Amino acid sequence: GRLIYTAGGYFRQSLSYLEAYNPSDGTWLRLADLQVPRSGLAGCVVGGLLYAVGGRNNSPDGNTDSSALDCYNPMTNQWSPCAPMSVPRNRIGVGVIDGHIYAVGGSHGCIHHNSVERYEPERDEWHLVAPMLTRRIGVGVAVLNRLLYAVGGFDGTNRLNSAECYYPERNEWRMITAMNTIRSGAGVCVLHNCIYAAGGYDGQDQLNSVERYDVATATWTFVAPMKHRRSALGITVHQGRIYVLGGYDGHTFLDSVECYDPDTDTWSEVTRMTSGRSGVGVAVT
Ligand SMILES: C[C@@H]1CN(c2ccc(C(=O)N3COc4c(cccc4-c4cc(N5[C@@H]6CC[C@H]5COC6)c(C(=O)O)cc4F)C3)c(Cl)c2)[C@H](C)CN1C
Numbered sequence: 001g002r003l004i005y006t007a008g009g010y011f012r013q014s015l016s017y018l019e020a021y022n023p024s025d026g027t028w029l030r031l032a033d034l035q036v037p038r039s040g041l042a043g044c045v046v047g048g049l050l051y052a053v054g055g056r057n058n059s060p061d062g063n064t065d066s067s068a069l070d071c072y073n074p075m076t077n078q079w080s081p082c083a084p085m086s087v088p089r090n091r092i093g094v095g096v097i098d099g100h101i102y103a104v105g106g107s108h109g110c111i112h113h114n115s116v117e118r119y120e121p122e123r124d125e126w127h128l129v130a131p132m133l134t135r136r137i138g139v140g141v142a143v144l145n146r147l148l149y150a151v152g153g154f155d156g157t158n159r160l161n162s163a164e165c166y167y168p169e170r171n172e173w174r175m176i177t178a179m180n181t182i183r184s185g186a187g188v189c190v191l192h193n194c195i196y197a198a199g200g201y202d203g204q205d206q207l208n209s210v211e212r213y214d215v216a217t218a219t220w221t222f223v224a225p226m227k228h229r230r231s232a233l234g235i236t237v238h239q240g241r242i243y244v245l246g247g248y249d250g251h252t253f254l255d256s257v258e259c260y261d262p263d264t265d266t267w268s269e270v271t272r273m274t275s276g277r278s279g280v281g282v283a284v285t
Pocket of ligand 1: 137231232
């Protein structure tokens with residue numbers, strides 16, 4: 001069995017919560033808090049270990065963007081610091097290829113990174129790789145066919161419908177077909193050989209629309225929209241279905257968790273998070 005882990009987030013200030021949802025029995029485990037509160041981080045798993053990457057601690061005492069990489073072992077219920085990234089990356093995107101973590105874009109104050117760096121858990125080291133063609137914060141990241149895709153975001157001036165992909169063997173990026181919609185702060189994941197981009201902000205409205213990229217045709221197609229429009233949502237895939245967790249809709253910090261079934265092309269509300277929040281990091285293990 002695997003659980004859906006949600007780390008950090010925001011509600012009034014950046015949060016330290018680490019909770020794990022079991023889709024079989026509907027329960028939430030309350031696990032060890034993060035050592036430093038953070039929102040705008042990303043989560044991922046390598047070798048059964050959960051990683052919390054980047055983010056920002058927005059507290060009553062100030063705002064500090066994070067270059068941290070922290071590792072949580074479900075077997076020990078303990079967080080351990082790892083080697084930090086070259087720069088702080090708030091509103092970061094992350095993807096894993098061959099057990100290596102890619103930290104994509106994100107911001108440090110007013111700096112909107114196009115830089116990308118890769119972590120090796122086997123050496124506890126980060127190294128920069130080729131930078132993206134576009135600066136991207138609030139970026140979605142997907143791994144498909146051993147390529148790393150960076151989708152949407154905000155480049156420091158405009159919110160983006162563009163997307164690009166990274167070729168690890170060549171160490172280079174190329175632009176791909178742009179989405180139908182501009183999405184800054186969307187949830188992006190891969191399911192059944194397709195990239196999904198759900199929600200996000202188009203510059204005027206919080207979105208409930210969801211679109212899917214088909215590699216062979218290089219096209220983005222709309223699929224069933226979510227019940228609740230949201231940005232800064234957590235997203236993951238568990239047992240052939242997509243789960244979206246929380247987020248912000250322009251008025252409320254959502255506790256809604258929706259689940260997308262690709263066989264029926266329908267979204268269903270399956271649980272609530274223990275408290276409404278946005279900007280979480282999510283992963284499954
Ligand atoms: C003081 C509070 C502070 N709030 C918030 C404070 C914190 C958060 C939060 O979790 N973060 C900060 O953002 C993000 C986080 C994670 C990923 C993406 C974003 C993000 C949100 C954006 N924004 C778009 C879509 C969401 C956000 C606002 O709406 C336009 C935008 C944009 O602009 O393109 C770009 C983004 F990369 C972490 C949020 Cl979501 C709200 C609210 C604004 C209410 N306020 C009263």
